[PDB]
């Protein structure tokens, strides 16, 4: 198991523009296109991202390329973030993937906001962090995914994904 396989399970890989859990236009493995209600705007963003007139449809390779870029960007965002970097540096390889997953889903700013949970993760207080992470809109809105990530932080294993 690795970060890509993990996110593939959590996000899937759709080849036609679709609406995410929040009703926003997305493509591939959770690549948000726009928060605008407009399908046209979505299509415009898609074409700009892939570099061709797509007509709302991407090929598998194109989607995968977007996926690779997004994973790379999440990691880099973490490393550049003053609040995130120290937690990431303190974790083992499995838990680092869990942190990457949260950043991929909610953006750096969003995760950076879980102040208390981050401090707990940094102190290796696993069960405490898991409880804290669960008190969030994130857990209430996408519970199954949040439980998978939470368990990963709690145990340090990939059990929730196997």
Residues found near Cl ion in the complex (CB under 5 A): 49, 142, 144-145
Residue of 10, 11, 45, 70 marked catalytic: 11
Copy the structure tokens of residue 90: 């303190």
Query: Considering beta carbons, is residue 4 or 119 the nearer one to Cl ion?
Result: 4
Q: Where are the beta strands (DSSP E) in the chain?
A: 14-19, 25-28, 31-34
Residue 127 known to be catalytic: no
Task: Determine if residue 117 is labeled as part of a ligand binding site.
Answer: yes
Task: Determine if residue 118 is labeled as part of a ligand binding site.
Answer: no
Residue 11 known to be catalytic: yes
Task: Determine if residue 153 is labeled as part of a ligand binding site.
Answer: no
For the bound state, the minimum distance from the C-beta of residue 17 to Cl ion, rounded and expressed in Å, comes to: 14
For the bound state, the minimum distance from the C-beta of residue 147 to Cl ion, rounded and expressed in Å, comes to: 8
Query: Considering beta carbons, is residue 53 or 144 the nearer one to Cl ion?
Result: 144
Query: Considering beta carbons, is residue 81 or 142 the nearer one to Cl ion?
Result: 142
Beta-carbon contacts of residue 104 (< 8 Å; ≥ 6 apart) = 7, 30, 70, 71, 74
Q: Cβ distance 7 to 30 under 8 Å?
A: yes
Neighbour-count burial for 140-159, b at 16+ CB within 10 Å, e otherwise? eebeebbebbbbbbbebebe
**Catalytically annotated residues:** 11, 20
């Amino acid at each position: 198991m690795n970060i890509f396989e993990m996110l593939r399970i959590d996000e899937g890989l759709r080849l036609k523009i679709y609406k995410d859990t929040e009703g926003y236009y997305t493509i591939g493995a959770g690549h948000l296109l726009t928060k605008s209600p407009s399908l046209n705007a979505a299509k415009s963003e898609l074409d700009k991202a892939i570099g061709r007139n797509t007509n709302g449809v991407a090929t598998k390779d194109e989607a995968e390329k977007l996926f690779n870029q997004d994973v790379d960007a999440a990691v880099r965002g973490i490393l550049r973030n003053a609040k995130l970097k120290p937690v990431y540096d303190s974790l083992d390889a499995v838990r680092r993937a869990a942190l990457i997953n949260m950043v991929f889903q909610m953006g750096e700013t969003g995760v950076a906001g879980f102040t208390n949970s981050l401090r707990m993760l940094q102190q290796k207080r696993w069960d405490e962090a898991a409880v804290n992470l669960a008190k969030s809109r994130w857990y209430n809105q996408t519970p199954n995914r949040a439980k998978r990530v939470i368990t990963t932080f709690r145990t340090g294993t990939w059990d929730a994904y196997k």
